[PDB]
Amino acid sequence: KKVIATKVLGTVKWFNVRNGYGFINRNDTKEDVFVHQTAIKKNNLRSVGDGETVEFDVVEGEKGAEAANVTGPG
RNA sequence: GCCU
Incomplete structure (x- = not known):
């Protein structure tokens, strides 16, 4: 899998622990x-x-x- | 395991 972008900041729209996935809204592209x-x-x-801010x-x-290698922004 |  090819890396498209690195050290991107975003806000977690929602993450469901039952299904094991969710979506993060990129702060730079709003996608x-x-x-x-x-x-x-x-x-x-x-x-x-x-609603939390993550880096990925x-x-x-x-x-x-x-997203990949998702963490906090530090 | 692509909109809970």
Whole structure:
């Protein structure tokens, strides 16, 4: 999977722990990117909370762009 | 595992 962008900031629109995925709104493009639980760095469960600010890379998965290496902004 |  190709890295599209790096160190992108965004706000978690929602993340459902039951389905194991959610969406993050990129602050730079205002577009939603898919985020799966496996793509989140640990100590985060592998989860993020609604409305929180996260930093992440954007990569090209099988069904389009998605987040990777998702953490807090520090 | 693409709108809860």
